[PDB]
């Protein structure tokens, strides 16, 4: 129901076939996606950080996005993409951003941890947070996802 894809270009055409290889100073194109029936339901990208653990309890000082705000300055957002399944009555909501990688760990095997927050895409709604955009954000309904990175 939730996805996280890495791509080699800002066309998000061709996802990497497992473990993404990355060197300092390169871009990484992330795509996150929610697949759902409700059409009032959106999401935002709450937090993203790199870390050498498959574990997020040991969070990390390498934070890219925090409370929907871009903390790393290399970060760019791209158009979001709602794509309809006609016959299954479904919608994939996708969001996209890049950043420039910096190696700073003591190891070559890393994790991109992103967490999605679900939210309500229509005004007047106790039931979940209304929705908000990334620099608008600079001014339980949350899902953790991890993808693997390989430094060279």
Author numbering: 591 to 729, 745 to 757
Article sentences:
Transforming growth factor-β receptor type 3 (TGFR-3), also known as betaglycan, is an ubiquitously expressed cell surface proteoglycan that serves as a co-receptor for members of the TGF-β family of cystein knot growth factors, i.e. TGF-βs, activins, inhibins, growth differentiation factors (GDFs) and the bone morphogenetic proteins (BMPs). Many TGF-β family members bind to TGFR-3 first, and this interaction subsequently facilitates the formation of a ternary signaling complex between the growth factor and the receptors TGFR-1 and TGFR-2. The 785 residue-long ectodomain of TGFR-3 can be subdivided into two halves of similar lengths. The C-terminal half contains next to a bioinformatically delineated ZP core domain (residues 454 to 728) a so-called external hydrophobic patch (EHP) that is part of a stretch of amino acids that connects the ZP domain to the membrane-spanning segment in TGFR-3.
